[PDB]
Design a protein around this ligand. Structure first.
Ligand code: CIZ
Ligand code: SF4
Ligand code: CL
Ligand code: CL
Ligand code: CL
Ligand code: NH4
Length: 303
């Protein structure tokens, strides 16, 4: 015919030409999810980055996630389609916060949420995500741990493990998940009285306390089989992910306006441009990468 390739067809050809895999987070735009080879949460993306047979990883997610993939694949090309795909919560944690906490608690393990920079991870004894933070902290050989950046996840970990949690920094949080309120819980239950509530641990504690399940986005997918109707208290693109996986269930956003600007820096067009031009190359300095890798590997061994 007269027509040629659209962006999807161009991307598919370039993936072949580059020997590339596209890894996407659950918060990516639906049309980006639809072209990804693998979609998952922070822990699943970290694990998947340890079995990459491709030469090139295009990371449809934020920069810290691409850096984690690069730390696990120092000799593969890792591309981030936009350097403005970044995480507001992760940037709240600086090396100075970690050093001050280590000074006060030298025997406390430093436990850093994967939502953190590579420089910060170089000071972690182990990394965690929302899916394994409780399990990891429970198993660490200390009754006190230094933990960050997210204070709402820290609250959940403190509740579930009974251990003393020293937050770094003092007020780290995700603006997307902080948008959920008790009024959103009330409205969701009024509009969808037969639905259960799946709530991310980055939400505030009083909202966590209303959950039927508290889970990472990966845990939400794992536990969705437990009911047929769910209100989803996380970034709104997760509703698309859940509807695609389970077309027979019903999913409703807790708030349509819970959007991550950094995640939406990734577009179909800049994924195309990323493969076409081999950009933007993600690099992590060797000393930081080796130290971060030790903490990330330990995390994968512990969960
Ligand atoms: C936002 C997020 C973070 C994580 O997995 O630790 C999630 O995908 O649940
Ligand atoms: S949703 Fe929140 S934690 Fe995730 S990248 Fe966006 S700002 Fe960061
Ligand atoms: Cl692969
Ligand atoms: Cl995220
Ligand atoms: Cl199913
Ligand atoms: N011990």
């Amino acid at each position: 015919g007269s027509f040629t390739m659209d962006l999807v067809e161009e991307i598919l050809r370039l993936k072949e030409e580059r020997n590339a895999i596209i890894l996407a987070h659950n918060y990516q735009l639906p049309e980006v999810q639809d072209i990804a080879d693998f979609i998952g949460d922070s822990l699943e993306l970290a694990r998947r980055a340890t079995r990459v047979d491709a030469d090139v990883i295009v990371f449809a997610g934020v920069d810290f996630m691409a850096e984690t993939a690069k730390i696990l694949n120092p000799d593969k090309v890792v591309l981030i389609p936009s350097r403005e795909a970044t995480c507001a919560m992760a940037n709240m944690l600086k090396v100075e916060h970690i050093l001050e906490a280590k000074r006060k608690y030298p025997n406390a393990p430093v436990v850093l949420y994967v939502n953190s920079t590579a420089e910060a991870k170089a000071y972690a004894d182990v990394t965690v995500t929302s899916a394994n933070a409780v399990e990891v902290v429970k198993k660490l050989d200390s009754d006190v741990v230094i933990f960050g950046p997210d204070k709402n996840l820290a609250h959940y970990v403190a509740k579930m493990t009974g251990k003393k949690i020293i937050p770094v920094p003092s007020k780290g949080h995700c603006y997307v998940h902080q948008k959920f309120t008790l009024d959103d819980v009330e409205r969701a239950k009024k509009l969808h009285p037969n639905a259960k509530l799946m709530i991310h641990p980055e939400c505030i504690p009083e909202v966590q306390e209303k959950a039927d399940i508290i889970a990472s986005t990966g845990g939400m997918i794992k536990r969705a089989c437990e009911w047929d109707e769910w209100v989803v208290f996380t970034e709104r693109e997760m509703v698309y992910r859940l509807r695609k996986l389970y077309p027979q269930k019903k999913f409703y956003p807790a708030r349509e306006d819970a959007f991550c600007i950094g995640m939406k820096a990734i577009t179909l067009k800049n994924i195309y441009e990323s493969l076409k031009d081999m950009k933007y190359k993600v690099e992590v300095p060797e000393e930081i990468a080796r130290k971060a890798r030790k903490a990330i590997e330990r995390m994968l061994e512990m969960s």
